[PDB]
Amino acid sequence: ARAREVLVALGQLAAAVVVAVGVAVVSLLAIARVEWPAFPSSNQLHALTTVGQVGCLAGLVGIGWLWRHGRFRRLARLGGLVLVSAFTVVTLGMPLGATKLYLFGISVDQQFRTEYLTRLTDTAALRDMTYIGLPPFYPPGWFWIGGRAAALTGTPAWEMFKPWAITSMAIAVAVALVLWWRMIRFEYALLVTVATAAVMLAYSSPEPYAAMITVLLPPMLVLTWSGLGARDRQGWAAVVGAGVFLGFAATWYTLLVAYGAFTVVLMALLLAGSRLQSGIKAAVDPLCRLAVVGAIAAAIGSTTWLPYLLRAARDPVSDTGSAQHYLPADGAALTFPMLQFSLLGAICLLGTLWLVMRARSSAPAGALAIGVLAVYLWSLLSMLATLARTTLLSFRLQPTLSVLLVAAGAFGFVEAVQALGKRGRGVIPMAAAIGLAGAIAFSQDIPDVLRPDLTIAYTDTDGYGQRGDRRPPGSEKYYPAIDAAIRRVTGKRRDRTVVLTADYSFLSYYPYWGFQGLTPHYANPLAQFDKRATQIDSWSGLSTADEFIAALDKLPWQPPTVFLMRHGAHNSYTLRLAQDVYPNQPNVRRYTVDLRTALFADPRFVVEDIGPFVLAIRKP
Amino acid sequence: RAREVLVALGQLAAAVVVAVGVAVVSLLAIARVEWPAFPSSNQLHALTTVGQVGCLAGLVGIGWLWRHGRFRRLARLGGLVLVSAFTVVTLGMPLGATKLYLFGISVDQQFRTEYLTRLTDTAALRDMTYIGLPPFYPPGWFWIGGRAAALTGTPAWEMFKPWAITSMAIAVAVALVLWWRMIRFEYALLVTVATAAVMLAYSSPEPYAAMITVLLPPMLVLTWSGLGARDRQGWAAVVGAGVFLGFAATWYTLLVAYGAFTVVLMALLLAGSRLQSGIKAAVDPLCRLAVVGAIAAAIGSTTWLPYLLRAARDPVSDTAALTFPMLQFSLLGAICLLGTLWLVMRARSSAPAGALAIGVLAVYLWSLLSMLATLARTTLLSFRLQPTLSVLLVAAGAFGFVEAVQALGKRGRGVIPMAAAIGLAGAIAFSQDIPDVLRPDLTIAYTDTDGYGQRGDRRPPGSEKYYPAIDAAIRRVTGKRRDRTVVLTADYSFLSYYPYWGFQGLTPHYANPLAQFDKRATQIDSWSGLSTADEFIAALDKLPWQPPTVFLMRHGAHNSYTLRLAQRYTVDLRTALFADPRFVVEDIGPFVLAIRKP
Ligand SMILES: [Ca+2]
Ligand SMILES: [Ca+2]
């Protein structure tokens, strides 16, 4: 058919990936050579960020101006890719210029993310983050590539969480730009991708693998809508593209693949219901294309979900503490970003009005309208599914709603300027001035929306026993000695040791296994968190070393061989625990179990005191 | 015109029946399941939000169905069902795990529950606490509540929540009926939903004042139309306004006073607007005002006559203003500002705008008259009128929003969907926040022991769990009916569960003016210093009132009993007083129940 334009599209996407990687590596390497002052205790970084993301917006205006008239038409595209990548990198990695940890440091939720990135760094295979022998549940897409990049190029996996997060976000933005200029004109592509990137950097920043899909949802929604409606010879490239995107998101983020599949099913149903006339021959074509999309998606996404569904087909999984047991305050109320007094609220209101008035006679507007409606239906469905003692995690779809509404708002701004620009001549400069002022006023609020994240990132001890605040380190400065003791006693590589700890930040830095994960929610259902916790709590009612060693040789699972406990309450070794009280708000409840210092009394234990911790290792 | 009147009566009766049926069925279904508590989990707020969204979407569907007109009857029935269901879902879902209304049995719910418990064991009209007195507080809501709680066998402390929710739903349905008789159906639905939402947000703690707060806009407009007309026409709205004032006089005194004030203002303005046109048509509004006033007094006398026939010869010597809701910064502030603009720009050419403008002017005149009357050592309570002001301004804001949408739609046609979208978003964003503005009330409702001895959030109950034992002991020692023995306590939540006559009220501003609260308190403080057991019997029988027979008093230091009533202070009695071989003294926990046996 001589449709080589597919080859050109693949070449453009590969060039986007290469350019984003190059910019995000060079910029970060250059930044990390200056010894900047701490962000929470100096304005040096928050001013250089503003300078950078103003110089990367004036540059975009210049590039868009150049594209309108010029014989180049190719330096404009390269400049656009370079400038969106640089905008993302400067917005994020400049405030984090003196620290080595990502947002939130090693705190509440980064613990298991860093643990899984550390797991997939000393092994190529797919293994669970904590437990031993199990196939992984959480999608190992981002972490596998991060682990390969950290195993190849030196640096430990806790240290390749900031650079790889920023680089992945830059890749997502630079690929979203390539996806937009295939559909709409170049200037509109620049404006829309900059708006969506600026929103994701402010809202889906802490989790740098939901941000990629969050940015790529609008272009892929438009591409699927235009390609599910084609008739009998057209859009078969868009169908395969949407299927590939859903398969890619299956191994990258489960909530967003669920939402995307929901939206695609709604799109196919709406199209099939709409064209129910002209016989049934034309009313089934959207269903055939939906079948093809599903067939590609659940064969690209089965390279990571097959081991789990093969081992969980027979094993007694618990699944009564599922990861979707969060019902926070904002998870019991719909989100209306269109109506909040602020610039984001104004642009979301403009997007809502544009979608309402242009849904029926536009290709992007219809797709974005169906996306927003599916977001709201998903929210209502999760609220209703709380009856079935489960949730659909609808409170993580707020950033997605913001991104969709901001893309529609940029579209509506362009449409309005081009509509009321007929009744006059000097409106493009004034509209550009107002829009640039608004963009500069918003993009300097990114480091201030993320202020708690940056403060936590600057006051957490990294894996070198240092703080990014250049203050005395916390408790994490003893872990090197602890690991040296563990490796000296057992004599086995740290992939073969099972460690029972209460401070789960030891296993984030070091690739030891675990007998109990940090939280009941992000724990493998095959692991039987409840029964492990029951067995652990039973040990509190023991007093003899022989009884304890007999208990440690009767568990169905693999027993701990290294215990990292704390002093407590007149010769008892306290290990803090956790429990899922889901219907209630603090969905997790912490409680303490204590061992009475006589269990670890044999010639078959080696008990040492290192700082506050006591390290009882079972001698081989 | 008997057909019009008969159809109006039929529609009002249908509204009452539909609201009752929907509220009862929904409340029973909700109470069937054992939901988690509100202060801990969020499973009840989520279901409240789902129900509200469903009801609002259904109302939009009904309004759309009205256009394609062949199902007008079904559209009206569905409208009534949906407004009633919206009210019931908004209130009774967060209170799905408890048996107490908002605030439970806290500061002011105690005498409301006490009066509902009074009017359940007897049908006549008597005071809530004191014996042998005619009631002062208007027993309209509580009488029907007592009949409903005595016919179905429910203890009267338990009928409070379902009866309050049902009454509020009935009020909303009747308001909707009045609106689609005055204006077109779609505007009726829209303004009824707006006023109902604001009423639920701000006037729910008092469920018999919210019945009338939601019914002031329709009746203001109806009375304005009924007094404005100058012919043999409009003689039915006059009777309707008179009957509404008579119904409000037995339901809520502050709002009947305010309504009579506003009606007098309306009649005066109408008479003075035609004074220079011949006095023949300048006194017609005054004649219609007199006809309104005769019916209102005739209907209010059935309740206020026993008190006034006794308060005319007895010692009756006892008893946040000026707010601007259109200037606050919220969605409500925006819609109230739009309503104020509409009232300013449309008062002289519209009847609803004129009526609502006169209502708001009356609210502010009342507010500025209360401040002046503070010089007279008294106030008109012009701080419980603020929810009324919010309701009036929101009704005006709904009218102004619709009229502005029409004016904008003169230039183009596609502004209707955009307005509908940004109005539905705002309606949902406000109505889903109602459980959060009532959060302190729900929190108190869930952490209060009910009449069975169990808290709402399944925690160890408080001291309200020994009451059944105290009751059994009293009814066994005295050997008489409950509403025959007078009880002197300072934990007044015992009398708000059981129909025992009291010797003292909670605070002086709840007591019956005929009750002489100050002299009773002085007599108790005189008992404080009494010496021996014989002096107690001597000084009990000299009281001009009915002396107590049962004393329910706690433990105190060094031979005291420490009644600890309020005026707040503490009064204690030496143990010697009850040591006579007449009183039966026994400890039922932290209490010392001393009953003067016959
Ligand atoms: Ca962990
Ligand atoms: Ca009382």
**Contact present, B245 and B292 (Cβ < 8 Å):** yes
Closest B-chain CA to A386: B43
Round to whole Å and give the CA distance between B447 and B439. Answer: 12
Nearest CB among A349, A356, A585 relative to B42 is that of A585
Q: Which of B423, B425, B443, B447 is nearest to B435 (CA)?
A: B443
Burial A45-70, CB ≥16 within 10 A → b, else e:
bbebbbebbbebbebbbebbeebeee
Round to whole Å and give the CA distance between B220 and B217. Answer: 5
Round to whole Å and give the CA distance between B312 and B145. Answer: 30
In angstroms, how far is the first alpha carbon of chain A from the final one? Answer: 68
Round to whole Å and give the CA distance between A584 and A598. Answer: 37
Clarify whether residues A389 and A299 are in a common domain: yes
Beta bridge mates, A614: A565, A609
- The per-residue DSSP string of B295-322 comes to HHHHHHHHHHHHHHHHTTSS-------S
Give the single-character DSSP code of B487: E
Residue type, B284: D
What's the Cα-to-Cα distance from B31 to each of B34, B148, B477, rounded to whole Å? 7, 18, 37
Residue type, B13: A
What's the Cα-to-Cα distance from A469 to each of A31, A155, A459, A475, B576, rounded to whole Å? 17, 21, 6, 15, 72
Task: Mention every residue, 6+ apart, whose C-beta is less than 8 A from residue B539.
Answer: B526, B527, B530
Tokens representing B547 are 């002396």
Nearest CB among A328, A336, A357 relative to B418 is that of A357
Round to whole Å and give the CA distance between B69 and A388. Answer: 40
* Angle ∠(A559,A565,A571) on CA atoms, nearest 5: 115
Q: Which of B331, B400, B423 is nearest to A356 (CA)?
A: B423
Tell me whether residue B308 is in a domain: no
Angle between helix axes A428-443 and A44-68 (nearest 10 degrees) is 150
CA dihedral A189, A195, A196, A201 (to 10 degrees): 140
List for chain B the helix, strand, coil content (%; round to 5). Answer: 60, 5, 35
What is the tally of helices (H) and strands (E) in chain A? 22, 7
Residue A577, CB-side half-sphere exposure with 13 Å CA sphere: 22
**Contact present, A292 and A243 (Cβ < 8 Å):** yes
Tokens representing B8 are 């109006």
- The per-residue DSSP string of A451-492 comes to HHHHHHHHTSB-TTS-BTT-S---GGGSHHHHHHHHHHHH-S
Beta bridge mates, A567: A573
| A498 phi, psi to nearest 5 deg | -110, 120
Round to whole Å and give the CA distance between B486 and A408. Answer: 72
The whole domain housing A526 covers 478-618
Beta bridge mates, A577: A591
Contacts of A585 in chain B (CB under 8 A): 40-42
**Contact present, A110 and A456 (Cβ < 8 Å):** no
CA–centroid distance, residue A124 to ligand 1 (Å): 20
Task: Classify burial at B424, counting beta carbons within 10 Å of its beta carbon; exposed 0-12, middle 13-18, buried 19 or more.
Answer: middle
What's the Cα-to-Cα distance from A318 to each of A382, A393, A498, A557, rounded to whole Å? 21, 19, 22, 15
* Angle ∠(B290,B292,B293) on CA atoms, nearest 5: 65
Residue type, A329: A
Ligand closest to CA A515? 1
Please give the biggest Cα pair distance in chain B: 92
Tell me whether residue B581 is in a domain: yes
* Angle ∠(B369,B373,B379) on CA atoms, nearest 5: 95
Residue B68 CB coordination number (10 Å): 8
Give the single-character DSSP code of B37: P
Method: cryo-EM
- The per-residue DSSP string of A15-73 comes to HHHHHHHHHHHHHHHHHTTS-PPPGGG-SHHHHHHHHHHHHHHHHHHHHHHHHHS-S-S
Give the gyration radius of chain A's Cα atoms.
27
Residue B148, CB-side half-sphere exposure with 13 Å CA sphere: 19
Clarify whether residues A518 and A438 are in a common domain: no
Clarify whether residues A366 and A232 are in a common domain: yes
**Contact present, A354 and A365 (Cβ < 8 Å):** yes
Clarify whether residues A488 and A402 are in a common domain: no
Q: Which of A239, A263, A225, A85 is nearest to A168 (CA)?
A: A85
Task: Mention every residue, 6+ apart, whose C-beta is less than 8 A from residue A174.
Answer: A16, A17, A19, A20, A81, A84, A85
Clarify whether residues A274 and A331 are in a common domain: yes
Beta bridge mates, A608: A615
Only one residue has tokens 């929540």, namely B161
Give the single-character DSSP code of B559: T
Give the single-character DSSP code of A106: T
Nearest CB among A327, A339, A583 relative to B425 is that of A339
Residues followed by a break in chain B (C to N exceeding 2.5 Å) are 319, 567
Cβ-based interface (< 8 Å): residues of A facing B: 327-329, 331-334, 336, 338-339, 349, 352-353, 356-357, 380, 383-384, 386-387, 583-585
Clarify whether residues A426 and A522 are in a common domain: no
Give the single-character DSSP code of B486: E
Inter-chain residue contact A352 with B53, CB threshold 8 Å: no
Q: Which of B258, B31, B262, B251 is nearest to B144 (CA)?
A: B251
Closest B-chain CA to A395: B46
Closest A-chain CA to B424: A336
Tell me whether residue A142 is in a domain: no
Clarify whether residues A411 and A482 are in a common domain: no
* Cα B129 from chain centre: 19
Tell me whether residue A608 is in a domain: yes
Task: Mention every residue, 6+ apart, whose C-beta is less than 8 A from residue B522.
Answer: none
Clarify whether residues A232 and A286 are in a common domain: yes
Contacts of A583 in chain B (CB under 8 A): 36, 40-41, 43
Round to whole Å and give the CA distance between A188 and A191. Answer: 5
Tokens representing B165 are 């929710």
Clarify whether residues A330 and A287 are in a common domain: yes
What's the Cα-to-Cα distance from B370 to each of B264, B325, B380, B403, rounded to whole Å? 18, 19, 5, 35
CA–centroid distance, residue B492 to ligand 2 (Å): 4
3-class secondary structure, A372: helix
CA–centroid distance, residue A329 to ligand 1 (Å): 25
3-class secondary structure, B571: coil
Task: Mention every residue, 6+ apart, whose C-beta is less than 8 A from residue A417.
Answer: A427, A428, A431
Task: Mention every residue, 6+ apart, whose C-beta is less than 8 A from residue B486.
Answer: B131, B500, B501, B502, B503, B546, B547, B548, B549, B550
3-class secondary structure, B488: strand
Round to whole Å and give the CA distance between B145 and B162. Answer: 10
Clarify whether residues A484 and A440 are in a common domain: no
Kindly state the helix (H) or strand (E) to which residue B489 belongs, with its residue range: strand B486-489
Only one residue has tokens 């500061």, namely B107
Round to whole Å and give the CA distance between B322 and B324. Answer: 7
Inter-chain residue contact B425 with A380, CB threshold 8 Å: no
Round to whole Å and give the CA distance between A137 and A283. Answer: 38
Nearest CB among A353, A357, A386 relative to B46 is that of A386
Round to whole Å and give the CA distance between A46 and A39. Answer: 7
Tell me whether residue B63 is in a domain: no
3-class secondary structure, A441: helix
Tokens representing B20 are 């009752």
Tell me whether residue B567 is in a domain: yes
Tell me whether residue B409 is in a domain: no
CA–centroid distance, residue A540 to ligand 1 (Å): 22
Inter-chain residue contact A353 with B418, CB threshold 8 Å: yes
Only one residue has tokens 């159906």, namely B185
Q: Which of B484, B392, B472, B407 is nearest to B194 (CA)?
A: B392
Round to whole Å and give the CA distance between A25 and B535. Answer: 97
Instruction: Quote the number of domains for chain B.
Output: 1
Round to whole Å and give the CA distance between B488 and A78. Answer: 89
Clarify whether residues A491 and A414 are in a common domain: no
In a mutational test of the A interface, the residue from B35, B43, B332, B434 whose CB has the highest number of chain A CBs within 10 Å is B43
Round to whole Å and give the CA distance between B535 and B528. Answer: 12
**Contact present, A80 and A190 (Cβ < 8 Å):** yes
Only one residue has tokens 């929103």, namely A199
Task: Mention every residue, 6+ apart, whose C-beta is less than 8 A from residue A75.
Answer: A66
Nearest CB among B46, B417, B432 relative to A356 is that of B417
Round to whole Å and give the CA distance between B35 and A391. Answer: 16
Q: Which of B531, B208, B164, B216 is nearest to B393 (CA)?
A: B216
Inter-chain residue contact A333 with B49, CB threshold 8 Å: yes
CA–centroid distance, residue B104 to ligand 2 (Å): 14
Å between B39 CA and nearest CA of chain A: 9
Sign of torsion, CA A189 A194 A195 A200? positive
Task: Mention every residue, 6+ apart, whose C-beta is less than 8 A from residue A58.
Answer: none
Round to whole Å and give the CA distance between A579 and A594. Answer: 16
What's the Cα-to-Cα distance from A423 to each of A357, A409, A429, A611, rounded to whole Å? 21, 22, 15, 76
**Contact present, B198 and B390 (Cβ < 8 Å):** yes
**Contact present, A129 and A511 (Cβ < 8 Å):** no
What's the Cα-to-Cα distance from B501 to each of B179, B426, B488, B592, rounded to whole Å? 44, 50, 9, 19
Tell me whether residue A107 is in a domain: no
Of A444, A469, A495, the residue at which a domain comes to its end is: A444
Round to whole Å and give the CA distance between B41 and B36. Answer: 7
**Contact present, B562 and B572 (Cβ < 8 Å):** yes
Clarify whether residues A402 and A518 are in a common domain: no
